[PDB]
Amino acid sequence: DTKIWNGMVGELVYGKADIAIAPLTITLVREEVIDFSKPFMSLGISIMIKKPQKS
Amino acid sequence: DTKIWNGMVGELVYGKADIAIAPLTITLVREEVIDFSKPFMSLGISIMIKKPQKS
Numbered sequence: 001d002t003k004i005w006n007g008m009v010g011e012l013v014y015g016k017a018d019i020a021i022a023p024l025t026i027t028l029v030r031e032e033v034i035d036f037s038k039p040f041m042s043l044g045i046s047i048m049i050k051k052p053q054k055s
Numbered sequence: 056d057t058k059i060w061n062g063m064v065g066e067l068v069y070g071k072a073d074i075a076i077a078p079l080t081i082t083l084v085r086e087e088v089i090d091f092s093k094p095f096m097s098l099g100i101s102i103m104i105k106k107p108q109k110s
């Protein structure tokens with residue numbers, strides 16, 4: 001609605017913060033306002049299920 | 056010895072080629088002369104063994 005970045009990106013856009021070191025997943029629209037570095041930690045959607053029981 | 060990039064990087068450094076779309080693993084020294092994009096294909100050293108079949 002407001003098209004205002006909240007969170008850590010809006011602290012970088014509006015000059016509140018100087019840099020961000022955080023678990024920040026790189027999307028396109030985040031790069032449209034600020035600059036990422038290279039992805040140091042590649043990941044994705046994993047499948048968390050239970051562990052086979054000791055019954 | 057010559058400190059001359061051969062291959063596809065030296066074609067980008069010496070103006071022979073315009074861009075590289077290739078299986079090019081990102082290192083530091085390759086970024087020291089040319090610019091990569093984001094890693095579209097993350098990978099690493101895998102373990103190729105035989106498929107086990109009825110020992």
Ligand SMILES: C[C@H]1CC[C@]2(OC1)O[C@H]1[C@H](O)[C@@H]3[C@H]4CC[C@@H]5C[C@H](O[C@H]6O[C@@H](CO)[C@H](O[C@H]7O[C@@H](CO)[C@H](O)[C@@H](O[C@H]8OC[C@H](O)[C@@H](O)[C@@H]8O)[C@@H]7O[C@H]7O[C@@H](CO)[C@H](O)[C@@H](O[C@H]8O[C@@H](CO)[C@H](O)[C@@H](O)[C@@H]8O)[C@@H]7O)[C@@H](O)[C@@H]6O)[C@@H](O)C[C@@]5(C)[C@@H]4CC[C@@]3(C)[C@@H]1[C@@H]2C
Binds near residue numbers: 015016
């Ligand atoms: C309750 C809130 C709700 C929301 C809100 O309402 C109220 O609305 C928000 C709104 O959004 C406001 C934001 C708007 C966007 C603003 C952006 C501004 O930074 C801008 O301008 C520079 C800082 O002033 C930034 O980059 C500086 O800091 C480094 C960023 O990485 C740069 O690298 C450095 O450039 C170089 O400076 C000299 C040296 O080489 C090095 O130190 C440096 O590499 C720049 O520092 C200054 O660098 C000088 C030379 O470039 C200029 O002083 C200026 O750079 C250029 O700035 C141009 C801006 O027009 C200008 O035209 C051009 O001539 C200047 O050369 C810049 O200052 C640059 O990345 C960015 O664009 C920031 O500080 C404040 C800012 C975030 C504002 C903070 C407050 C808000 C968030 C408002 C507030 C939350």
